[PDB]
Design a protein around this nucleic acid. Structure first.
Lengths: 157, 157, 157, 160
DNA sequence: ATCTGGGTAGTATATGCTATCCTAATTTATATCTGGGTAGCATAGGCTATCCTATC
DNA sequence: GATAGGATAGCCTATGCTACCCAGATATAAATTAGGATAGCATATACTACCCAGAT
């Protein structure tokens, strides 16, 4: 048939459970269970995370949602396009405002050891799969200053 | 104004306001020479100007585009909620606030930091609707493998 | 439900049967690995193959398969093996003594092709499980002669 | 006359002492005693089978019982029949499995220089006397390999 | 009272979500591919006179 | 004058030959579910000069 609903009542950030994302999250947290890791931090301030890019859009988004479900203590940026970086060799370099076709999403965590573990787990999860999935590159982040947005200084929640 | 002027997504350039903003930036950036370019081509750090407002951020994006040759910009995107004070419990991992951001990648730690510092100081000189701009030293060891194919690489080299 | 009684087929009716058909097909496929004549001009029986061991039914089936595979062979009926000299200088059994192990004997014309048939039967048995592998095969060389010239020309009289 | 039946005690492949079989065995042994040979092997390996055939059924069963008690190490089997073979004429040939009425029984002897002497004795002593028995031609199997020398289970003497 | 820069509506186009087809072990039948056991025709190895010549 | 000697039984011991119909191991096509992915409102920008009032 056609798309079962254009608009589902879910704005940005309204992400529910789904069997595909459920399986992806289960695989990730099984990979994330290979080492003693902490899902959160006491202060819960976002100064680190994971950078994931490359590959097709529909695979990058699914990987983002899977990382979300696997770590309910994470913060995720939306996908967006990319520009073209510096080319190798002394030639005509591209413009700053140009739009590529490569997508990316960013992860906001608290610590960096766990962020490295998450990046490694995502790398393994991608490596287990073919399709555009392997084209999805992953790198690290370290927001030493902060991505501060007032995180409701933790009481009982 | 309004309507499709025929210009596609990502067709902009010089303007006196962004020219002045970039003059201030480079004047701050010219107080100490740094290796603004890298041999490897791929960069090791990015820029994450967030805060202010969408209009101020877009103006600063243009003022950063026309500021240095070693800079390429993503479209502005929004930021995930730290923890929403609206409801009782914590929001979902995907919940995204109204604070915007955009990404431009700079090699080396000092050159990456000074662009953000100049942006902050310039918006501090400006009125307040833009003083709420804060940036972070998002340094990545493994780096980002951006696509280096410049738009004129189809018919030039 | 249907057992096997006297079908009127005397001692010598080598009628085709799918089990014996495929057994013989496999045998002559194995027998096709060497270039040895299946007959001799004078057609005098001075050699053959000796096959024994395993269950009675396996031995009979192997004999029928060798018959169908080589229409230029002569096959003796099955019977029970004797009690050969086992190790141990004790009360050796009677010379007439017979074991519970069955056997059948093949009468061919030459000896090189007889050894080829022996090896082919060995391989054919070896590629099988069940009591089939219990079947043993050894060679024969009737240098004296099992000659018995018939006087009945069954083709026309 | 005095034809009978019923159980007579002894089982399959068991010799007996009868004057006729005694005389046949004495003749064979006397022929076999003209030249000493290794009637058995130091490891008990038989490399020469025996294929007494021909004659008639009764004259062959009696020859079997006569050869039972004349040779130290022999492995005579129950009697069976023989395949037909050739056909009268160049072209036609009978079936492969077609078996004639000439009977035989298998024996085994160690070494190739005692099996031939057994053949000669079991041929002459039983053919150069009875008309209906003058057709037991022997084709003692002169193998170049071995057979199942120990086809025996541990319960020797039908005991332990 | 002009400066002044500095933010700023009003469209084509890329998104966070929710929807809809190739594949990939994963069973799972599906045929095979050989071994049991089925009887008259044949078959052993025992018997007390039978042998009947066949033989002295 | 019995016997050489095959041969003579006939039920005892129990062999097998012809051909199979079942009784399972053993590959092996074919499904099969299930895990990947590919898609629409409603927002989000980029570009559009221009407004347009701080800001004196």
């Amino acid at each position: 048939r056609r798309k079962k609903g254009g608009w589902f009542g879910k704005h940005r950030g309204q992400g529910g459970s789904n069997p595909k994302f459920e399986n992806i999250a289960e695989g990730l947290r099984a990979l994330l269970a290979r080492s003693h890791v902490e899902r959160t931090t006491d202060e819960g301030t976002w100064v680190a995370g994971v950078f994931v890019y490359g590959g097709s859009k529909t695979s990058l988004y699914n990987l983002r949602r899977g990382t979300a479900l696997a770590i309910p203590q994470c913060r995720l940026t939306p996908l967006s396009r990319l520009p073209f970086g510096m080319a190798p060799g002394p030639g005509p370099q591209p413009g700053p405002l140009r739009e590529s076709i490569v997508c990316y999403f960013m992860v906001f965590l608290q610590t960096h050891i766990f962020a490295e573990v998450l990046k490694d787990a995502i790398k393994d999860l991608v490596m287990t799969k073919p399709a555009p999935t392997c084209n999805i590159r992953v790198t690290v982040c370290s927001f030493d200053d902060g991505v501060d947005l007032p995180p409701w200084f933790p009481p009982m929640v």
